[PDB]
Design an enzyme around this catalytic site. Structure first.
Site: not given
Length: 329
Positions: A125, A174, A177, A180, A291
């Site tokens: 590609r 984040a 709290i 996380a 990814d």
């Protein structure tokens, strides 16, 4: 349901297969992915007729997919990203839809959309991209409500490319709290080198550092030092402070992934997992597979967690990803 939140640039892909000429008409050469210029804009329309089965994605987008399908449930992942009032987006929402994604994309007034003509060969590609009708995300002030309950926050360093407020304001909340997680992906050499002063703060308000050798080295070159794997991995992690603690996944292409857990007494451990990837030409997808890694990493992250486990999981994410077409889920 929602248990992973991604923030980045919603970009669309237009995989096709164009005779050499088509390719040569828009001076692109084979084995090239670059930023479209003025004569390559009228190209979207072009490959917008052929037989191109266009899918949604990007970096944070593709990474989420994983996560998302890794799950199987609807709205188990949300993502915020800038789109324009364009049919390239109108299809960018219904398509991301069918995948069971809970992304929220604000529309960029007369901004138009953004894709990446993904020309090929029998596999090989060439991609032409237009990242700018996607760079004007200003995190909505109520974005925390839209992701309200989520404990796994993510976004690609690309995010900075506009303004580091968003990916800035995402790990700051984040951090508030409830316990996380903040993960950032080094993205390109540009983000790293062409960003600094922002990453230094981001870095600290980062629980997860995702990336490869290339920039970790262009990152290492950015901080007081020298040097390797443990070198940069623990040297890059070696920054200040703050099983979701402070990671830094040093994907060494094929070479074993290389990380380290940071254990409560402050003891630095280093996570090292090679990569049993048995395959041929069915490789080539340097992005779409990194990814992927981020995908299983944030999937198996929302499901039990485990040093080598998550890292050893994205392995079959990319492995299985770099296999099929540009992010064929």
């Amino acid at each position: 349901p929602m248990r992973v939140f991604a923030i980045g640039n919603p970009i669309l892909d237009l995989v096709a297969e164009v005779p050499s000429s088509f390719l040569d008409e828009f001076f692109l050469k084979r084995g090239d992915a670059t930023l479209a210029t003025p004569e390559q804009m009228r190209i979207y329309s072009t490959l917008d007729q052929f037989n191109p089965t266009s899918l949604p994605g990007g970096s944070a987008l593709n990474s989420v997919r994983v996560v998302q399908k890794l799950l199987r449930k609807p709205g188990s992942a949300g993502y915020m990203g800038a789109i324009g009032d364009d049919p390239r987006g109108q299809v960018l929402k219904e398509l991301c839809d069918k995948e069971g994604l809970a992304t929220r994309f604000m529309v960029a007034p007369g901004q138009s959309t953004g894709t990446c003509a993904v020309l090929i060969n029998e596999k090989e590609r060439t991609l032409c991209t237009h990242l700018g009708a996607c760079g004007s995300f200003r995190i909505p002030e109520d974005w925390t409500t839209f992701a309200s309950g989520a404990l796994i926050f993510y976004a690609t360093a690309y995010t900075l490319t506009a303004t580091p407020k968003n990916a800035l304001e995402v790990a700051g909340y984040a951090h508030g709290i409830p316990n996380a997680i903040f993960t950032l992906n080094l993205s390109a050499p540009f983000c790293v080198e062409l960003y600094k002063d922002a990453m230094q703060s981001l870095l600290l308000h980062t629980n997860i550092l995702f990336g490869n050798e290339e920039e970790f080295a262009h990152l290492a070159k950015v901080h007081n030092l020298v040097a390797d794997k443990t070198a940069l991995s623990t040297a890059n992690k070696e920054h200040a402070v703050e099983g979701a603690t402070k990671l830094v996944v040093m994907t060494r292409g094929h070479n074993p992934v290389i990380a380290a857990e940071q254990t409560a007494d402050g003891t630095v451990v280093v996570h090292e997992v090679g990569v049993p990837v048995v395959a041929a030409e069915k490789i080539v997808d340097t992005n779409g597979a990194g990814d992927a890694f981020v995908g299983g990493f944030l999937y198996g992250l929302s499901q039990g967690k485990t040093v080598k486990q998550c890292i050893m999981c994205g392995n079959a994410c990319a492995q299985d990803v770099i296999q099929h077409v540009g992010f064929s889920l």
